[PDB]
Design an enzyme around this catalytic site. Structure first.
Site, PDB file in Angstrom:
ATOM      1  N   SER A   9       7.824  -0.764   1.486  1.00 38.15           N
ATOM      2  CA  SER A   9       8.321  -0.628   2.876  1.00 38.15           C
ATOM      3  C   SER A   9       7.985  -1.389   3.676  1.00 38.15           C
ATOM      4  CB  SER A   9       6.830   0.112   3.695  1.00 38.15           C
ATOM      5  OG  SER A   9       6.402   0.065   4.738  1.00 38.15           O
ATOM      6  N   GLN A  60       0.523  -0.852  -0.076  1.00 38.22           N
ATOM      7  CA  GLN A  60       0.247  -0.081   0.136  1.00 38.22           C
ATOM      8  C   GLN A  60       0.694   1.437  -0.096  1.00 38.22           C
ATOM      9  OE1 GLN A  60      -2.363   0.807   3.406  1.00 38.22           O
ATOM     10  NE2 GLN A  60      -3.781   2.009   2.461  1.00 38.22           N
ATOM     11  N   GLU A  83      25.017   2.784 -11.927  1.00 34.21           N
ATOM     12  CA  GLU A  83      26.960   3.482 -11.628  1.00 34.21           C
ATOM     13  C   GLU A  83      26.450   3.962 -10.359  1.00 34.21           C
ATOM     14  OE1 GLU A  83      30.124   2.731 -13.523  1.00 34.21           O
ATOM     15  OE2 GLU A  83      30.105   1.206 -14.600  1.00 34.21           O
ATOM     16  N   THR A 112       3.925   1.497  13.336  1.00 30.65           N
ATOM     17  CA  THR A 112       2.485   1.848  13.411  1.00 30.65           C
ATOM     18  C   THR A 112       1.868   0.008  13.565  1.00 30.65           C
ATOM     19  OG1 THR A 112       1.972   3.277  11.572  1.00 30.65           O
ATOM     20  CG2 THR A 112      -0.071   1.039  11.523  1.00 30.65           C
TER      21      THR A 112
HETATM   22  N1  LIG Z   1       5.621   7.769   3.279  1.00 30.05           N
HETATM   23  C1  LIG Z   1       3.915   7.062   3.233  1.00 30.05           C
HETATM   24  N2  LIG Z   1       4.157   5.262   4.406  1.00 30.05           N
HETATM   25  C2  LIG Z   1       3.067   4.921   3.935  1.00 30.05           C
HETATM   26  C3  LIG Z   1       2.065   5.496   3.331  1.00 30.05           C
HETATM   27  N3  LIG Z   1       0.963   3.899   3.595  1.00 30.05           N
HETATM   28  C4  LIG Z   1       1.631   2.763   4.370  1.00 30.05           C
HETATM   29  N4  LIG Z   1       3.095   3.586   5.162  1.00 30.05           N
HETATM   30  C5  LIG Z   1       3.835   2.954   5.552  1.00 30.05           C
HETATM   31  O1  LIG Z   1       3.771   1.596   5.599  1.00 30.05           O
HETATM   32  C6  LIG Z   1       3.725   1.291   7.439  1.00 30.05           C
HETATM   33  C7  LIG Z   1       2.637  -0.198   7.524  1.00 30.05           C
HETATM   34  O2  LIG Z   1       2.794  -1.198   6.749  1.00 30.05           O
HETATM   35  P1  LIG Z   1       2.515  -1.045   4.871  1.00 30.05           P
HETATM   36  O3  LIG Z   1       3.884  -0.854   4.050  1.00 30.05           O
HETATM   37  O4  LIG Z   1       1.764  -0.856   4.903  1.00 30.05           O
HETATM   38  O5  LIG Z   1       2.230  -3.035   4.585  1.00 30.05           O
HETATM   39  P2  LIG Z   1       1.262  -3.334   3.964  1.00 30.05           P
HETATM   40  O6  LIG Z   1       2.254  -1.775   2.296  1.00 30.05           O
HETATM   41  O7  LIG Z   1      -0.190  -2.527   3.387  1.00 30.05           O
HETATM   42  O8  LIG Z   1       1.233  -4.785   3.316  1.00 30.05           O
HETATM   43  P3  LIG Z   1      -0.014  -5.259   3.852  1.00 30.05           P
HETATM   44  O9  LIG Z   1      -0.003  -5.201   5.480  1.00 30.05           O
HETATM   45  O10 LIG Z   1       0.373  -7.161   3.899  1.00 30.05           O
HETATM   46  O11 LIG Z   1      -1.291  -5.216   3.549  1.00 30.05           O
HETATM   47  C8  LIG Z   1       3.012   2.776   8.220  1.00 30.05           C
HETATM   48  O12 LIG Z   1       4.210   1.793   9.526  1.00 30.05           O
HETATM   49  C9  LIG Z   1       3.197   3.612   7.242  1.00 30.05           C
HETATM   50  O13 LIG Z   1       4.865   4.317   7.555  1.00 30.05           O
HETATM   51  C10 LIG Z   1       2.167   5.744   2.627  1.00 30.05           C
HETATM   52  O14 LIG Z   1       1.090   6.443   2.029  1.00 30.05           O
HETATM   53  N5  LIG Z   1       3.223   7.068   2.463  1.00 30.05           N
HETATM   54 MG   LIG Z   2      -2.048  -3.275   3.269  1.00 32.90          MG
END
Ligand SMILES: Nc1nc2c(ncn2[C@@H]2O[C@H](COP(=O)(O)OP(=O)(O)OP(=O)(O)O)[C@@H](O)[C@H]2O)c(=O)[nH]1
Ligand SMILES: [Mg+2]
Ligand SMILES: Nc1nc2c(ncn2[C@@H]2O[C@H](COP(=O)(O)OP(=O)(O)OP(=O)(O)O)[C@@H](O)[C@H]2O)c(=O)[nH]1
Ligand SMILES: Nc1nc2c(ncn2[C@@H]2O[C@H](COP(=O)(O)OP(=O)(O)O)[C@@H](O)[C@H]2O)c(=O)[nH]1
Ligand SMILES: Nc1nc2c(ncn2[C@@H]2O[C@H](COP(=O)(O)OP(=O)(O)O)[C@@H](O)[C@H]2O)c(=O)[nH]1
Ligand SMILES: [Mg+2]
Lengths: 119, 437, 431, 437, 431
Positions: D140, D11, D254, D179
């Site tokens: 992330s 996400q 590079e 989180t």
């Molecule tokens: N900079 C930024 N960070 C985000 C955003 N959305 C989520 N995050 C980061 O993502 C973390 C939550 O875990 P995710 O990487 O979102 O997990 P996911 O991508 O939803 O994967 P699943 O949980 O399996 O669905 C949070 O701690 C945020 O810091 C965003 O829109 N912008």
């Molecule tokens: Mg998600």
């Protein structure tokens, strides 16, 4: 502690509050000295104005002096007459004598500009 | 190639800054928004603003000033006033609570919170600098922000910059007029803690400014606006040689070497002439000799000390306008042939003069008149010893049985600092005496 | 920013603070239905010093109403401006205890102290940098002298670094005013001594003399005296609400006010008080303003300043004026009446100017004078307390409540130490 | 020819891509429906968009992006959003149920059914291309799809592509803020499974950008959109050299070979400058020396980690805009001569510069004002030792009594590989501290 | 398309399910007949989560209402939003159960288990991607305990991977509201331990307290009490049907709260929670929402959160807000409350912010706490079970149709066992 006495004391207090005492305020109003900005809408979001708000924000950031004709608290009086009386032609070397730099000087001003940063 | 960073601390710093910067902007043609407009710009020159402004953006000039205070209101008026667009918003630094006329509050508590921020901003301004000749620091001895956090600024700037010089414009508490009661404590504390750090502190009495405003300016209803306007004219006459070409140009590092004889004797007295009004300037014939003796009058001296009760150690005269050095030298010769104007015997030559061609510009809505010449004498007489003996006495009556001391000793100062400051001022008074003999 | 919470306690407190919020809301341009309707831009500069923000452009006063019987707050939330407060801040007690310090302090009042402190914490953690507490009461009765002192003691031991001012209606030189009042005043000023960074003593008889010797008030009633109190109790903190040439807040006044910690009992006063008939024959200037300031008739505490020596005086001016004239008038009064000022404190005047006048009243001024003449009030209360305390009179209520005579004796010990302190600093010499 | 393949997983990664493709579209002048606008580029088009957008015969531009997420919410939001016709409808890959912050679900149970289609589309995009430079993988460290699926995807690309460069953009967990609760677990697992296939991974923390938005951009309510916009500006600055021209042009192939000293410390940082808002940007000199000084500040890194307890192992500057390279040399000389900025004893050479001509592009509905200069600074500093150590300590506190392990052992990973990842991160930390000798 | 099947058991189950379906239909803009009477198209993108498309525009809910008497079926059918249900899903018995676990688990209702399982299979096999089952029963009663636990056991045996949550109503601390409630509470929670994955223990007494102290509500009626629980329903299931910045589903909440498998009893909460009067006098922001979030007068379980320690807290936010503030306040509540949270698990807060706030509100919050304070309910019901089993109270009318005492023995064994792990992981030292 006797319970029903506690609750009906609270009941009497409440019915004294929500008797006829609510006004249901009929003015949104703007305080033009605080600002909040929390939308920052998504670029894909297609699901997401007030002339009085434009007027109040203009009079908030209108550089005071142009909104009042008579002054206010004297810190808004000290600079009430920023316009210099007489045209005051500053190019006249006879009257005004400003220091004008020269191309021999500007170059080595630039030369010691990064030399002086580690004195 | 030359400039000076202005740090304005306290209410007595920022209101004098509001007078000073309108004087500089109206003198250099800067509009309050920061844009040089039409009929003001001249081709391929006019770098007079470079000593106090910096060319920025696409035609904007921003001043080299740091406005600091621990309380709001007097600074957010500047943030929301006529000059709200002139200053960089990170240069208008405020705190949360006020120093409450307490040197301990200014120096050992909440004053030592925004000190890192103001030194960071001063470091950024000195990075933007293209050659620094010093810091013009504007304050009152007064109480609170003008003493504690200003003395903290002295300490931090002395241990950080070092070789760079710091000129202070300090508002002295008057002999008779007072508006607070802990100012004998605050003045002695900040004098003790900025004696070793200040390079030259020009001393000002509000009561003397009200006297000259009611007498010469014919202002029966004066105020802080007129006081800071006149102080702004004084500092403009100090710095005019950095901005305009003259027969004798004298800058900050020349001014300090010519004035002070000793590294502790650095508290001179300023007077400006003419302070004539617009209606009374029609009947006068303003000339170099009659404004030199007007500066040497014991009624335009801007700290309530008659120079008759002492000797002139040194004297610096700054002339602006249509002034010729022949009349300068004739006036100096006449003053030297006067008998009651007593210089010390160990300083035979006693005048450092400078002449600048640019006349002092006047602000509309002010009280001073437009004149074709002006003198800005900053003598270094021994008459300040009487005033500081008087305020040492005023400190002694209050410190006889510990008045207004529980605040300081409960919020962080120890008892011995007051005694150390008192003996330091006693030693300094004896220094004045032994130099004056 | 700076912010103060107002803390009405008792019948007297809940009336004076209600008129205070009416007056300050009319000054800041707030209708009874909590919305801005003013015409001047500078009113919405420092709303946050007395109000908290509520949604839809609403300003709710930071006020706590405390009483030990519901009827006073029921009367408050019945008339104008009674529906401006948070209804959760109304903290009630269904017990009584209206004229007994002991039963207001260590009894059914002390079950309500947890609720009133909870409301205090809720109103005090919802702001960025809290400055202090203003709390209004009278030095007599159970709900304004026991509740008030217990609440001040709890807030002092909780938040010790904030400023604390209380506005207490001290008793009268003549008459009685609720017979156990010498008791309540004695062991209420006992807790006022250690706590309460500054205390404002207001005399009812002095107030009546102000309303009828200068203001006429052919029907002077009760709200007009509350208006006279609230004018100065709003004008003390006008440097927090409006910018001026020389501002001075509560901490400034407290620092340059008391030379010693146990000397924080002052006399308020308002300068431009004149009759409607004599309004025409007047010229509102700094000389006449300070002339009616330095005035034994306009002191709201009786305690004549020429029966003692002034320790520190303070002037807070409001309006368009010249401070050459302001400092010249303070210089003139100190040069002329030099014997009434202590000579070991040179220039014992603190003057400040805010150039925002009230409604009407082209210029105004507020006087706060700390003198040695409050020793008359303290000596009178000590004499009456000893007269009613020697023959064990009016004490069985307190002892059956649960106290003992040692607290009363140490209360007189503290009071006599206070009287000796004022006498010593009255007759003390420079050298 | 110089291209990218952008894989947006999770996400957070899809939100980054939502900002990034808006920025890319606005840079290259494309419309949101994919069509190039009429009556422009009459000279024969331009080859600037070929890095990011493929060209079909219909005049529409198809991005080289693979959106993927196991949760069918954010990808479906993209599919129904404004950028619906721009993306290839079969590139918008989405699942049916998410991994839900579970590495086991993201890597073994749920993620193994979708990595097949993702490899198929990555091969299709790579085959429909000339001269592949690298893979921009935006994810992330929060985990689930961000950790497990990205780790599985990178493991599968390792056997497929090999020598190709894999630039990763990951959001590191904040030093005080997390989180999810299993963030130590999934960060240690994704680090174990990305230490062997990654080439250069940029961590961009969240509360660091929150503080940057509070101070520099001057907003008190920064949502995720501002963070995605800043990361989009970072990636636009790092990929501007493949699309525009100027001075020394630094390629995706590079800077990974000039930033990584040993093949375990491929973990640099990122810092944009100036990140200053409109009103504060108006009142300052945007000059090379001060922008480099702002790059070398402890309060401007995109990861909250002080660059004073660690040494700059290597650093790369990207000057996007009209930057003269003599000022660049003078600036880097000033930072190299200044104290408190330290490099390791094997580092007399520690800077790589790349300067472009194209200025940064402002997005409408943003906060950053457009300015003629910017520096994207990539430091591979060893200061992240403390952050790695506290994440190791958090994982030790978690695994010390088997908390949140029943999910992983039920549907995947085991205690044995947990101990293997524990000793692998111990090896990484001891190598990281062995470097700084 | 994530899919949840809704089940109601007993009088309490049917009533709370009716209120939940009413609230969710009001949110999705579905009239009681079935036609979409709404405004925006965003509520049709995920309408398949709680609705099944029919011929025309009708959307039938996936509810599998169960009872052993037709009275509550007739009540919910005659009531509003009662004709929206599929008439083939109303499965009711004829003999009678509703206060006896044996009557609801082993006989009488045991005949209806096949029919209810048939309806459950038919509704759960029409789903594209099933996620879980929400049972809205109430432990301690009859069919809410017996039928609910037997259905949970059968569904967990059939579908071992799908997520499973119950919304059981626990016995009140005071009163009883049912005499054999201590028997049925243990006899239900024994099956709830090793079968369910989430159990949101809602309490009638805490519901009364939050309806009275916070919501005022002089008459508490009955609709508001279940309306709060329905608000908790729609708050906790928001991310599956609405888009947002941070999305956390039922499985993400599962892996975020419960550390060890038999620790899945959670405390619900809902916190815009404004009163009838003090709503204009109250400003709703993230600070005020978080203040109501972490407040003991808001957690709608009987157990006091001061006792024990917080294992973890979820924070489901609805509305349009800022991630920095909703992040730093969950930082600062942990910073302020040191010993309240567990030290061996750092940062015990899982946030999830979603758009589309509920109807007639700006922002909303849904507290879900997994504190160790919930051991008090387990301890107290273990106390009553011991007190009545030592003398065999009400035991022969359990044993009349089977029910040898071994079921009670290794029901009480696990009953005190869960108390043992709660006590062991409550105050364990980290290292
Ligand atoms: N900079 C930024 N960070 C985000 C955003 N959305 C989520 N995050 C980061 O993502 C973390 C939550 O875990 P995710 O990487 O979102 O997990 P996911 O991508 O939803 O994967 P699943 O949980 O399996 O669905 C949070 O701690 C945020 O810091 C965003 O829109 N912008
Ligand atoms: Mg998600
Ligand atoms: N000439 C002149 N003097 C001023 C002005 N404003 C304040 N002062 C002097 O300042 C003295 C009071 O001390 P300040 O320096 O103002 O103290 P402050 O700056 O207000 O700092 P705090 O006391 O902590 O609030 C007074 O005695 C005045 O003489 C001004 O505008 N002009
Ligand atoms: N100036 C003034 N005095 C008041 C006011 N209300 C009460 N008092 C005085 O307070 C005295 C009694 O105080 P009381 O009402 O018993 O205080 P309580 O015990 O807190 O209720 C009376 O004699 C009044 O003179 C008021 O609004 N203004
Ligand atoms: N919310 C709610 N709770 C109920 C209801 N009926 C009973 N309860 C609670 O559940 C317990 C007994 O449930 P019971 O009436 O036996 O449920 P039944 O099996 O459906 O008859 C009591 O302690 C009540 O507090 C209801 O209709 N709604
Ligand atoms: Mg001040």
């Amino acid at each position: 502690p006797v319970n029903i006495v506690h609750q009906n004391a609270i009941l009497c207090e409440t019915i004294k509050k929500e008797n006829e005492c609510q006004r249901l305020y009929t003015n949104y109003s703007i305080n033009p000295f605080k600002k909040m900005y929390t939308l920052t809408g998504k670029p894909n979001s297609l699901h997401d104005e007030d002339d009085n708000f434009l007027r109040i924000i203009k009079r908030s950031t209108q550089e005071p002096g142009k909104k009042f004709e008579f002054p206010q608290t004297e810190a808004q009086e000290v600079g009430w007459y920023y316009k210099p009386l007489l045209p005051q032609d500053r190019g006249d070397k006879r009257i005004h004598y400003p220091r004008q730099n020269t191309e021999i000087t500007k170059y080595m001003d630039e030369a010691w500009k990064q030399k002086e940063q580690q004195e | 190639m030359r400039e000076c960073i202005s740090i304005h601390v306290g209410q007595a710093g920022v209101q004098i800054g509001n007078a000073c910067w309108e004087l500089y902007c109206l003198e250099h043609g800067i509009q309050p928004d920061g844009q040089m407009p039409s009929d003001k710009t001249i081709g391929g020159g006019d770098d007079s603003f470079n000593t106090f402004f910096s060319e920025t953006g696409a035609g904007k000039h921003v001043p080299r000033a740091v406005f600091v205070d621990l309380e709001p209101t007097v600074v957010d008026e500047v943030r929301t006033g006529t000059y709200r667009q002139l200053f960089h918003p990170e240069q208008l630094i405020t705190g949360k609570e006020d120093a409450a006329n307490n040197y301990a509050r200014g120096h050992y508590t909440i004053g030592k919170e925004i000190v890192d921020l103001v030194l960071d901003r001063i470091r950024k301004l000195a990075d933007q600098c293209t050659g620094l000749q010093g810091f013009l620091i504007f304050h009152s001895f007064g109480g609170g922000t003008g003493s504690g956090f200003a003395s903290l600024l002295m300490e931090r700037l002395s241990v950080d910059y070092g070789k760079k010089s710091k000129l202070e414009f300090a508002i002295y508490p008057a002999p008779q007029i007072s508006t607070a009661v802990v100012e004998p404590y605050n003045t002695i504390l900040t004098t003790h803690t900025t004696l070793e750090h200040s390079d030259c502190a020009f001393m000002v009495d509000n009561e003397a400014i009200y006297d000259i405003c009611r007498r010469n300016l014919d202002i029966e209803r004066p105020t802080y606006t007129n006081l800071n306007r006149l102080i702004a004219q004084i500092v403009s006459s100090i710095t005019a040689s950095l901005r305009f070409d003259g027969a004798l140009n004298v800058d900050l590092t020349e001014f300090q070497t010519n004035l002070v004889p000793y590294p502790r004797i650095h508290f001179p007295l300023a007077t400006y002439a003419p302070v004539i009004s617009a209606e009374k300037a029609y009947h006068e014939q303003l000339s170099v000799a009659e404004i030199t003796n007007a500066c040497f009058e014991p009624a335009n001296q801007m700290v309530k000390c008659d120079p008759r009760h002492g000797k002139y150690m040194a004297c610096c005269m700054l002339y602006r306008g249509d002034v010729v050095p022949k009349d300068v030298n004739a006036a100096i010769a006449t003053i030297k042939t006067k008998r009651t104007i007593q210089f010390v015997d160990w300083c035979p030559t006693g005048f450092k003069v400078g002449i600048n061609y640019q006349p002092p510009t006047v602000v509309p809505g002010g009280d001073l008149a437009k004149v074709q010449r002006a003198v800005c004498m900053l003598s270094n007489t021994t008459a300040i010893a009487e005033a500081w003996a008087r305020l040492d006495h005023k400190f002694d009556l209050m410190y006889a049985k510990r008045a207004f001391v529980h605040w300081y000793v409960g919020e962080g100062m120890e008892e011995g600092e007051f005694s150390e400051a008192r003996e330091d001022l006693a030693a300094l008074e004896k220094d004045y005496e032994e130099v004056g003999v | 920013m700076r912010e103060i919470v107002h803390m009405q306690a008792g019948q007297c407190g809940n009336q004076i603070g209600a008129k205070f919020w009416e007056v300050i809301s009319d000054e800041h341009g707030i209708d009874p239905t909590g919305t801005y309707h003013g015409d001047s831009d500078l009113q919405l500069e420092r709303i946050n010093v007395y109000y908290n923000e509520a949604t839809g452009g609403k300003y709710v006063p930071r006020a706590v109403l405390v009483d030990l019987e519901p009827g006073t707050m029921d009367s408050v939330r019945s008339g104008p401006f009674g529906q401006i407060f948070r209804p959760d801040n109304f903290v009630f007690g269904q017990s009584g205890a209206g004229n007994n310090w002991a039963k207001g302090h260590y009894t059914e009042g002390a079950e309500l102290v947890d609720s009133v402190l909870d409301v205090v914490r809720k109103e005090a953690e919802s702001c960025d940098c809290l400055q202090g507490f203003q709390l209004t009461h009278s030095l007599g009765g159970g709900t304004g002298s026991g509740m008030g002192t217990l609440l001040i003691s709890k807030i002092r031991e909780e938040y010790p670094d904030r400023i604390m001012n209380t506005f207490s209606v001290v008793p009268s030189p003549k008459v009685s005013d609720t017979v156990v009042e010498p008791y309540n005043a004695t062991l209420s000023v006992h807790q006022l001594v250690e706590n309460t960074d500054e205390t404002y003593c207001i005399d009812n008889e002095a107030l009546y003399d102000i309303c009828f010797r200068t203001l006429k008030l052919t029907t002077p009633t009760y709200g007009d005296l509350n208006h006279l109190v609230s004018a100065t109790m709003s004008g003390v903190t006008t440097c927090l609400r409006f910018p001026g040439q020389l501002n001075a807040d509560l901490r400034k006044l407290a620092v340059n006010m008391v030379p010693f910690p146990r000397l924080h009992f002052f006399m308020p006063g308002f300068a431009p008080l004149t009759s409607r008939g004599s309004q025409q024959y007047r010229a509102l200037t700094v000389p006449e303003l300070t002339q009616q300031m330095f005035d034994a008739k306009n002191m709201m505490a009786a305690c004549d300043p020429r029966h003692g020596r002034y320790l520190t005086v303070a002037a807070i001016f409001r309006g368009r004026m010249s401070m050459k004239e302001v400092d010249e008038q303070m210089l003139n009064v100190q040069n002329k009446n030099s014997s009434y000022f202590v000579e070991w404190i040179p220039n014992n005047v603190k003057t400040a100017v805010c150039d925002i006048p009230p409604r009407g009243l082209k210029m105004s001024a507020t006087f706060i004078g700390n003198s040695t003449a409050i020793q008359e009030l303290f000596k009178r209360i000590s004499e009456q307390f000893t007269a009613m305390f020697r023959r064990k009179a009016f004490l069985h209520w307190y002892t059956g409540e649960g106290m003992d005579e040692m607290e009363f004796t140490e209360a007189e010990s503290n009071m006599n130490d206070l009287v000796s302190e004022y006498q010593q600093y009255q007759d003390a010499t420079a050298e």
